[PDB]
Amino acid sequence: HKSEIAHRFKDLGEEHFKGLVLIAFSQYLQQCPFDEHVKLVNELTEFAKTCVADESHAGCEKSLHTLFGDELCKVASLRETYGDMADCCEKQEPERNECFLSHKDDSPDLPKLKPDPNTLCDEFKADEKKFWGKYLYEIARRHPYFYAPELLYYANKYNGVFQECCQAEDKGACLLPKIETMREKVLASSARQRLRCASIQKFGERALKAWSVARLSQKFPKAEFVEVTKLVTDLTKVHKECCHGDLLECADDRADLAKYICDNQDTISSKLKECCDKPLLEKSHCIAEVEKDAIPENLPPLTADFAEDKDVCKNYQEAKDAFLGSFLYEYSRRHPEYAVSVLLRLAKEYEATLEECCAKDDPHACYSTVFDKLKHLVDEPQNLIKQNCDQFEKLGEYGFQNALIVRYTRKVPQVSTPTLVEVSRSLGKVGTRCCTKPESERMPCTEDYLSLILNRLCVLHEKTPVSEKVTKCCTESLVNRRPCFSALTPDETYVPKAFDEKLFTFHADICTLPDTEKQIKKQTALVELLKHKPKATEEQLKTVMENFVAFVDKCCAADDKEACFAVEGPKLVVSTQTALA
């Protein structure tokens, strides 16, 4: 094979080749109009056709990053719009590509889409193919690390909603409830993908490799270790390419793995027949959301192969990761009730056991009791679930988010205000997703979602590092972030921020902004309130909130709102400064 660009074009097809390139251009340059990206895709698509016809043509043998970076460099508004990004084109490959990835903005500050069904159903009937591309460009631009093959899946499921709803008598009643249930699934899928790339770039290939061992052995307990390692090797490669910008190699390798899984169902799992009958994009998504398989009937006891064996040390030193991956496989297949975050926590703790036990003269007496130490790790988080869920039912979602806003602001005051608000909102959403679930299967729920939300706090904070407490928990370990953040305490080393009148100034626009925007504004002032008064008790903060609610209710109803906010505004500040002094 001499032409990489022709190999990807023939395997994926024109439609999927064009979409994946549009996604790639959207993640690299997030401040560019949609029309300009269509031109870059069309030009690169025409070049791809030429290489398939004639492979010996000049330029067909270059790497996919070279051709990609070459087109990114011809953007006339590279410097004036992206600043220092224009200096990436002054280097060679692969340093040129690494320079580009480093400029992916995880907070693109892009406008919020307010979709109305009238004009939205109109653009779909006008051009379904462009309305399809507009969704890809819009999602990829706000999530520059999105799993690209799944972006095409959601894009086709997006037209499918309009396919069925733009024909009914009430388009609004049909479209909005479907896209909202889909809006939460895409943000969930983006946060999961954002954590996978973070594992590689910050904790190494071994981190993502062990991630798949936990999930795969959990979902496929019947598959033997040699089969699980085969899938792990190819899946880690697939994700490694997507997280590295090789979207064409990523999707093509996902299809090959989706095909390999179906052609070996009898050795992997018995619940894939329905999954292995859908089209390419739907099939790959089915395998990712498939139910777990049944546990074998006569599994040998765990203690046999890694505790009572007089060769645990010997087997470990000859193949450390392979023996440890074996321990994760044996443990994940028998405990599908646990969280993936808990399994990697059990294996990481077992790793630390062998390293210190084999160092002793008689490791046998040292490592023989590891089973008791590991079992105690499962019960440590259990106490936090009850307390959080009880506070959830009492205050509700909104009252819980403001509760977490208070708890986490005193915990890490140095973190910027918009990050503290947005994170605490996601933390409050966890209660609605987990405490209502079975208390005998919810245990992973909390631990699972918390690892995806705390990762975003690290991702947001690593851009502009300002808090010493956040940096430690984010770089110490990947699996122990949740206990590292719950164990943090409000430190008396933080000096309260000086008072800012603007941070407590409000206009009549508070009565107009959308509901989400209204809450954000009210929650922003709550963060800045505690940043200035870090020692305000709960009874005082209770009084201030009720004083503000009755206030905003008063001024949003007067015939002259600006005069109400002008007069009553200073009144609240004096009363609040008096109660908090």
Binding residues for Cu cation: 1
CB 312 → ligand OP6: shortest distance, Å?
9
Q: Which CB, 61 or 305, lies closer to ligand OP6? A: 305
Helix, strand, coil content of the chain in percent (nearest 5): 70, 0, 30
Nearest to 305 by CA among 282, 328, 286, 284: 328
Whether 409 and 444 have beta carbons less than 8 Å apart is answered as no
Sequence ranges of the binding site: 1, 4, 11, 65, 241, 244, 246, 249, 252, 256
Question: DSSP string covering 105-139, please?
Answer: -SS--PPPP---HHHHHHHHHH-HHHHHHHHHHHH
Q: Which CB, 301 or 465, lies closer to ligand OP6? A: 301
Amino acid found at 233 = T
Sequence ranges of the binding site for Ca(2+): 4, 11, 241, 246, 249, 252, 256
Q: Which CB, 252 or 330, lies closer to ligand OP6? A: 330
Q: Which CB, 15 or 84, lies closer to ligand OP6? A: 84
CB 76 → ligand OP6: shortest distance, Å?
13
Nearest to 28 by CA among 133, 96, 105: 105
Q: Residue 409 burial by CB count (10 A; 0-12/13-18/19+): exposed, middle or buried?
A: buried
Q: What is the DSSP letter of 292?
A: P
Locate 487 and state its tokens: 């164990």
CB 327 → ligand OP6: shortest distance, Å?
9
Q: Which CB, 265 or 315, lies closer to ligand OP6? A: 315
CB 269 → ligand OP6: shortest distance, Å?
23
Q: Which CB, 89 or 580, lies closer to ligand OP6? A: 89
CB 228 → ligand OP6: shortest distance, Å?
13
CB 243 → ligand OP6: shortest distance, Å?
28
Q: Which CB, 264 or 315, lies closer to ligand OP6? A: 315
Contacts of 277 (CB under 8 A, 6+ apart): 283
Binding positions for ligand OP6, rule: CB under 6 A: 304-305, 315, 319, 322-323, 326
CB 108 → ligand OP6: shortest distance, Å?
25
Q: Which CB, 326 or 467, lies closer to ligand OP6? A: 326
CB 233 → ligand OP6: shortest distance, Å?
15
CB 370 → ligand OP6: shortest distance, Å?
16
Sequence ranges of the binding site for Zn(2+): 65, 244, 246
Cβ count near 201 (within 10 Å): 11
Locate 263 and state its tokens: 């052609």
Which CA distances in Å does 500 have to 528, 531, 533, 540? 9, 11, 12, 20
Per-residue buried b or exposed e for 342-355, using 16+ beta carbons within 10 Å of the residue's own CB: bbbbbbbebbebbe
Q: Which CB, 299 or 573, lies closer to ligand OP6? A: 299
CA-CA distance, 452 to 448, in Å (whole number)?
7
Whether 222 and 207 have beta carbons less than 8 Å apart is answered as no
Q: To 10 degrees, the CA torsion angle through 150, 156, 160, 161?
A: 50
Give the residue at shortest CB distance from ligand OP6: 305
- Which sign does the torsion angle of CA 355, 359, 364, 368 carry? negative
